[PDB]
Amino acid sequence: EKASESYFMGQMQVARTESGGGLHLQLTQPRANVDLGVGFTAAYAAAAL
Amino acid sequence: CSTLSLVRFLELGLSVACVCTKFPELSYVAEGTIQFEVQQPMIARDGPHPADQPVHNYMIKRLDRRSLNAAFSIAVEALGLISGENLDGTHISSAMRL
């Protein structure tokens, strides 16, 4: 549907860690959702085989 | 007689497939490899990716050399008249030269 669910996108953080002569930092961005629809708000169905 | 209807490659259709570009000094620089990788995309999966080696997304692409040949023989009596070696002032030898 149009408004299936809210979707909250946070801010990004890094993890500056060196391992084995090479800088290895990863990226992370926390997320969260909630289905802002009373009753069902999305339906699927098997089309082919 | 019969003509020789020439054909251009750029005016064909196949030209869409390949980008043609002239590289004059290639045969000299072709002594070594060129060896440029391209790319590889990657999805951002959840969960922390380990701090390990296998992060490769840059498979390598290496050049291959190809050529073309042809044969263009010319007779012995031709270049004699061409270079004017076996030639004399008569109207005949100045006609065969043409």
Task: Give residue ranges of A with CB < 8 Å to any B CB.
Answer: 17, 19, 24, 26-28
| Token output for B38 | 């391209």
Using the 8-state DSSP alphabet, how is residue B51 labeled? S
Using the 8-state DSSP alphabet, how is residue B64 labeled? -
CA distances from A3 to A7, A35, A38 (A): 10, 9, 11
B contacts of A12 (beta carbons < 8 Å): none
A contacts of B48 (beta carbons < 8 Å): 26, 28
* CA separation for the pair B25, B28 (Å, rounded): 6
Q: Which technique was used to obtain these atomic coordinates?
A: cryo-EM
Q: Check A17 against B51: CB less than 8 A apart.
A: yes
Count of CA atoms in the C-beta half-sphere (13 A) of B24? 0
* CA separation for the pair A32, B9 (Å, rounded): 57
CA distances from B51 to B19, B35, B44, B58 (A): 41, 28, 15, 18
* CA separation for the pair B78, A16 (Å, rounded): 79
Using the 8-state DSSP alphabet, how is residue B23 labeled? -
List all residues 6 or more positions away from B87 whose beta carbon is below 8 Å from its beta carbon. Answer: B80, B81, B93, B94, B97
* CA separation for the pair B31, B65 (Å, rounded): 10
Identity of the residue numbered A8: F
Identity of the residue numbered A25: L
A contacts of B47 (beta carbons < 8 Å): none
Resolution given for this structure, in angstroms: 4.4
Q: What angle do CA B55, B59, B61 make, to 5 degrees?
A: 160
- The DSSP line for B11-42 is TSSGGGT------TTHHHHTTS---EE-----
Q: Check B48 against A28: CB less than 8 A apart.
A: yes
CB A14 within 8 A of CB A7: no
